[PDB]
From a paper:
To further understand the mechanistic basis of anti-phage defence by CapRelSJ46, we solved a crystal structure to 2.3 Å resolution. CapRelSJ46 contains a conserved, N-terminal nucleotide pyrophosphokinase domain (toxSYNTH) that is also present in alarmone synthetases and [name]-pyrophosphotransferase enzymes, which mediates toxicity. The smaller C-terminal antitoxin domain consists of a central antiparallel three-stranded β-sheet with an α-helix connecting β-strands β7 and β8. The antitoxin domain is topologically analogous to the classical zinc-finger domain (ZFD), but lacks the conserved cysteines; we refer to this domain as a pseudo-ZFD. This open state captured by crystallography is probably stabilized by crystal lattice contacts that are incompatible with a closing of the active site owing to clashes with symmetry-related partners. In addition to predicting the open conformation observed in the crystal structure, AlphaFold also predicted a closed conformational state in which the C-terminal domain folds back 110° onto the toxSYNTH central β-sheet and blocks the ATP-binding site. The crystal structure of CapRelSJ46 suggested that L280 and L307 in the wild-type protein promote the open, active state, with L280 stabilizing one of the hinge regions involving the pseudo-ZFD and L307 structuring the β6–β7 loop that interacts with Gp57 A-domain.
Using genetic, biochemical and structural analyses, we demonstrate that the C-terminal domain of CapRelSJ46 regulates the toxic N-terminal region, serving as both antitoxin and phage infection sensor. Following infection by certain phages, newly synthesized major capsid protein binds directly to the C-terminal domain of CapRelSJ46 to relieve autoinhibition, enabling the toxin domain to pyrophosphorylate tRNAs, which blocks translation to restrict viral infection. Collectively, our results reveal the molecular mechanism by which a bacterial immune system directly senses a conserved, essential component of phages, suggesting a PAMP-like sensing model for toxin–antitoxin-mediated innate immunity in bacteria.
Numbering used by the authors: 14 to 92, 104 to 297, 303 to 373
Amino acid sequence: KYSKSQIEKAARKIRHGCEGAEREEAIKMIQNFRELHLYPLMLMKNHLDRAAKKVDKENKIIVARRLKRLSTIIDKLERIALTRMQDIGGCRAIVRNIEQLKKLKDRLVKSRSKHKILKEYDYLTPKPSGYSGIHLAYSCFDEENGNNPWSKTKIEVQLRTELQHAWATSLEIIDTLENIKLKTSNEGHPEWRRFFYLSGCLVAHDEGACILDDETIKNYQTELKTLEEALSVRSKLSTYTFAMKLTSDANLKKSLPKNHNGFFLVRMRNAITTGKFLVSVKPFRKKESEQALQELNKDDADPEVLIAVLLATNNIKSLKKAYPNYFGSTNQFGRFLSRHIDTV
Ligand SMILES: [Cl-]
Ligand code: NA
């Protein structure tokens, strides 16, 4: 119900501060723009699913869709023009191998629909972050439209392999749970960033997306062994994903308050000196945020506390919704890490 100039003006008015009736109109303008991607998003999820079912007759390629939350869009404008964004709507196809990935990419390219691939982002050679896969940026209803309100809606399609998705899930889990910002920054955490780049490169080599020479492989595994022991990646992935699994537990869910929208203080304790070795989740209310931060910072003094992290229940639920197979993906990345670290 709004014009593209009205939507661009509303995004500007949110970046520039807004209040009251002016804000309600601006948030309605951007919310309208956001739910305009819902139809082409659900459409592209079915177009992609149809292609995946022709590529793998066994129906094992996993297809998913995700619409960026209104809250996430406003926070990006508060803290890349709105109408020029390709990530508002995104689809993801997870295939078993590089062969199956290239077949599905070609099936989508050769296909003839009103939905055009504007750019093909080939990341079979890992990005500086370590990420590998292929992204197809679509302009749905690009030329053939008519009285179509969804003319030129941008939807991104990410094609990735089971191991490339295992790498991406583990990155998202460490990034979100450790509260560090690898994805939304170009600085800090050198050991985490370098660990993800090298492991990403090893994923691309193993998958056959970017084969590296024997010497580089050897050097990359020594670097990886060193980075993994320094950061304790395997131990953290197991603890964080088990703690997330524990939040979805029936006994825990019955003990929690109604529509709990708070925090979970995840810990790993070595009180074995003989004592006990445990992993605990402690829930907090939304009002008890500071009390929760005070308990988290108090554990730095405790030598028994090996892992201590504060998780918002909204971050937990969205990670489980965006990565339904996070338990398995994480374990498959740790097994991958283990087989490269035990080489020499
Ligand atoms: Cl998943
Ligand atoms: Na409490």
